[PDB]
Amino acid sequence: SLTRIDHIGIACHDLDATVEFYRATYGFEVFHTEVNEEQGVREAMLKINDTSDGGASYLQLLEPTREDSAVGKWLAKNGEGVHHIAFGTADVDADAADIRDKGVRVLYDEPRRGSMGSRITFLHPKDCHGVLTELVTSAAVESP
Amino acid sequence: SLTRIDHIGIACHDLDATVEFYRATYGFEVFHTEVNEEQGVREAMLKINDTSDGGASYLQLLEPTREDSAVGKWLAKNGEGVHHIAFGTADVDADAADIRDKGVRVLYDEPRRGSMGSRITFLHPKDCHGVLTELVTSAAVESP
Ligand SMILES: CC(C(=O)SCCNC(=O)CCNC(=O)[C@H](O)C(C)(C)COP(=O)(O)OP(=O)(O)OC[C@H]1O[C@@H](n2cnc3c(N)ncnc32)[C@H](O)[C@@H]1OP(=O)(O)O)=[N+]([O-])[O-]
Ligand SMILES: CC(C(=O)SCCNC(=O)CCNC(=O)[C@H](O)C(C)(C)COP(=O)(O)OP(=O)(O)OC[C@H]1O[C@@H](n2cnc3c(N)ncnc32)[C@H](O)[C@@H]1OP(=O)(O)O)=[N+]([O-])[O-]
Ligand SMILES: [Cl-]
Ligand SMILES: [Cl-]
């Protein structure tokens, strides 16, 4: 089941400047940062709240590490802004198989590594009314 | 203080069809629907989770009631997809005055009515790294 909004993925040209914007404007602090070379992003997660399924909701700020990447291409075309939304689940593999069986394109055969050891997949935006949609199971098991 | 992600505003051409997409695909049900003639939208709120500040997080699906509206213009230009993000607060008036004093454009002098009697304002996307950003205080006071 999809039990929370896990994060909002926000593309930006300069991670450090956008991180500082969110800190200065709203007081949001960095929960974690990393590079994901497979996905081609430098990310910062800003935790906004905890959630009733035991998880949390974040802003995921993303700067591309290369132009030939999902975020690099998207920024070139659209400029800075919201790139994707992510829903949390305790079983991404099962929920992705169920959604595949509805005819929505699931981009990975098997979930891949995302933020903080999470396992993630994506649904094609043209099958989701224009919203690039991620499904994520956190690495650490959640207590509702 | 901004204490949660309150909702993700998602523009769509046909509210009923997009509502059914989210129900069929994810099991998300409609929490509330309404028309906001000032804003020029037909909305459906789909509750995804409760939040640690006592509030909740929703998907806010929005179909324009007229082409000459924020969502009508945005859909014409961009097609269906994420239109804005919203942060919850117990005091939108105070948080909007604090953000105004940082030089971020606050679109309303005074918060206006939004979903379920909430009071809302917006920050200009060109001051927020391309993200149209809403601040909202729910009508019913929250218990953290
Ligand atoms: C690490 C992590 C992350 O979130 S890493 C996030 C970065 N990684 C990803 O986004 C991976 C998933 N995304 C992708 O694989 C690709 O970007 C997509 C879904 C396949 C699109 O790649 P394509 O090669 O088709 O790009 P392409 O520009 O050709 O686009 C194909 C169609 O998708 C539309 N599109 C592309 N990106 C889109 C987006 N983010 N949202 C909406 N529509 C999008 C695009 O406008 C075009 O529509 P049009 O044809 O009507 O113009 N994490 O843990 O949470
Ligand atoms: C009821 C409710 C709701 O959420 S009702 C949601 C619908 N209402 C709103 O969005 C009201 C706030 N928005 C607005 O007032 C306007 O849409 C904006 C911020 C002033 C933009 O209106 P403008 O008249 O300037 O539109 P305009 O197309 O001229 O756009 C001015 C610049 O803003 C960019 N822009 C416009 N809409 C944008 C959006 N949603 N996100 C990012 N950028 C945006 C646009 O691309 C252009 O950039 P460019 O110049 O680089 O091309 N609720 O309770 O939660
Ligand atoms: Cl890596
Ligand atoms: Cl009304």
Ligand SMILES: [Co+2]
């Ligand atoms: Co993500």
Ligand SMILES: [Co+2]
């Ligand atoms: Co809204």
